[PDB]
């Protein structure tokens, strides 16, 4: 537009729930409904308590996951773009933005818990989805892993930004894209945790 006075601003990313991994059962919890989400995206002021490692996040148009690792809440650029995140004190600007890696990060919210980067060098992995499914994945390269049991891409949609974990529960990567044939995901592409660690320097 040429009329700057009426140009709009995009809202903030808003935390609307979490994937609870604290007990013996993984389950999704919603912490904010759609009306409250819309309001919070506009103001960027979110006073809700944050807990856990894996957050469910939303914009006005999309919903996906974000994962705390080393004191940074990470997600995908294809979901968040350059948006701020809502926080108790107002919008918080990204501390990391890398379109080439499809990676963004903000300082981790107070109350969150961070995963530790994996140093195990192990190839037996576990992908956590927005529905709290824990999907076994065999690592197949730096940024790929195969599903032991393939799934329609519908099952994975909305889980970009979520973690791949090793057997000990360390972060191995951030889910980025599905490797799909005829709508069936046989594998996943992820941003390796080492790439996050390099971004942090
Ligand atoms: C459905 C579950 C998927 C996790 C998910 N992500 C996606 O939907 C991403 C977003 C977009 C497309 N895509 C794919 O997964 C596609 C697909 C299945 C849609 C057909 N696969 C593909 O292109 O494989 C090709 C392959 C060669 C394997 C790509 C590897 C390179 C990957 C790569 C490297 C560097 C930069 C970029 C990329 C890809 N990238 C930018 C980018 O923007 O990708 C999601 O759930 N998104 S979401 O619904 O949460 C959304 C709201 C956030
Ligand atoms: Zn590990």
TrEMBL record:
It comes from the Viruses. Zn(2+) 2 binds at residues 118, 120, 166, 170. Zn(2+) 3 binds at residues 118, 166. Residues 22-201 form the Peptidase S29 domain. Zn(2+) 1 binds at residues 118, 120. It is found in: Host cell membrane; Host cytoplasm, Host perinuclear region; Host endoplasmic reticulum membrane; Host lipid droplet. Disulfide bonds join 118-120. Belongs to the hepacivirus polyprotein family. Homodimer. Interacts with host SPCS1; this interaction is essential for viral particle assembly. Interacts with envelope glycoprotein E1. Interacts with envelope glycoprotein E2. Interacts with viroporin p7. Interacts with serine protease/helicase NS3. Part of the replication complex composed of NS2, NS3, NS4A, NS4B, NS5A and the RNA-directed RNA polymerase embedded in an ER-derived membranous web. Part of the viral assembly initiation complex composed of NS2, E1, E2, NS3, NS4A, NS5A and the mature core protein. Forms a heterodimer with envelope glycoprotein E2. Interacts with mature core protein. Interacts with protease NS2. The heterodimer E1/E2 interacts with host CLDN1; this interaction plays a role in viral entry into host cell. Interacts with host SPSB2 (via C-terminus). Part of the viral assembly initiation complex composed of NS2, E1, E2, NS3, NS4A, NS5A and the mature core protein. Interacts with host NEURL3; this interaction prevents E1 binding to glycoprotein E2. RNA-dependent RNA polymerase that performs primer-template recognition and RNA synthesis during viral replication. Initiates RNA transcription/replication at a flavin adenine dinucleotide (FAD), resulting in a 5'- FAD cap on viral RNAs. In this way, recognition of viral 5' RNA by host pattern recognition receptors can be bypassed, thereby evading activation of antiviral pathways. Cysteine protease required for the proteolytic auto-cleavage between the non-structural proteins NS2 and NS3. The N-terminus of NS3 is required for the function of NS2 protease (active region NS2-3). Promotes the initiation of viral particle assembly by mediating the interaction between structural and non-structural proteins. This is Genome polyprotein. The chain holds residues 1027 to 1688 of 3011 of the full protein.
